């Protein structure tokens, strides 16, 4: 009810290669 | 989701008290759709105070309130000895949900 | 534009019991409706909102599943029914009626009854 804000993706960037993590944090990350 | 407040908040005629509760983010921090009603026992709580800081006609201008984050308080001032009333704090959780608060109880 | 509650009684738990309050005029089908539940010695505990033409429909948590909303326009009287009451559940059933005609929502309770006490 509230809303779940723990489930966040990458918005901005350039582009993510194949099977690569992205663990980098306007704000990019947005919930 | 009850809004939770004070039991009781002390006063005395002539003074000024304030009757706050406390929420959430997700329900008092999220609309600006805060009211706060006066109740008396035996009887129906009577509507004196919504939109946060607004009242309808015929609610004394004594009774105000204001909002700040995800809490919410209701000003009383120049209390008389007829003031003397449990106090209920309503705001929209959302999803088009209504929850009251616990309820204060003003002494004079 | 007096409302008057009526249908509370002392029932054994596990019956279904059903609330109603009489709104005075004709501006009932005009006006939503709100259901209000005060359990002795505790707060205020909201039961659903109905709108005024009773489309769509509101109900707490609490009492989802449980308690029915529903408004009979003919009659000018507003209806709350309760299914399998349990003990834990005896408080005064009072209706209320939006501020504003039709649905708002967005205002407090401008008239409400007398109050319906409820025993399990």
């Known amino acids: 009810h509230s809303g779940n804000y723990d489930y966040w993706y990458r918005l901005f960037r350039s582009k993510l290669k194949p099977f690569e993590r992205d663990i980098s944090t306007y704000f990019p990350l947005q919930s | 989701s009850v809004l939770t407040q004070p039991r009781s908040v002390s006063g005395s005629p002539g003074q000024s008290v304030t009757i706050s509760c406390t929420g959430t983010?997700?329900?008092?921090?999220?609309?600006?759709?805060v009211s706060w009603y006066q109740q008396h026992p035996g009887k129906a709580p009577k509507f004196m105070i919504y939109d946060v800081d607004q009242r309808p006609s015929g609610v004394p201008d004594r009774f105000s309130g204001s909002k700040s984050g995800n809490t919410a308080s209701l000003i009383i001032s120049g209390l008389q000895a007829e003031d003397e009333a449990d106090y209920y704090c309503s705001s929209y959780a959302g999803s088009y949900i209504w929850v009251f608060g616990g309820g204060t109880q003003l002494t004079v | 534009v007096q409302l008057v509650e009526s249908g509370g009684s002392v029932v054994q738990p596990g019956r279904a019991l059903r609330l109603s309050c009489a709104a005075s005029?004709?501006?009932?089908?005009?006006?939503?409706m709100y259901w209000v539940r005060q359990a002795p010695g505790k707060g205020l505990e909201w039961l659903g909102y109905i709108a005024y033409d009773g489309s769509d429909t509101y109900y707490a948590d609490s009492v989802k599943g449980r308690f029915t909303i529903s408004r009979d326009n003919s009659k000018n009287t507003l209806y709350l029914q309760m299914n399998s009451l349990r003990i834990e559940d005896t408080a005064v059933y009072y209706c209320?009626?939006?501020?504003?005609?039709?649905?708002?929502?967005?205002?407090?309770?401008?008239?409400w009854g007398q109050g319906t006490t409820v025993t399990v």
């Open positions: 005029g004709i501006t009932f089908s005009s006006f939503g």
């Open positions: 983010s997700s329900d008092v921090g999220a609309y600006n759709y």
């Open positions: 209320a009626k939006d501020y504003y005609p039709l649905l708002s929502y967005y205002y407090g309770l401008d008239v």
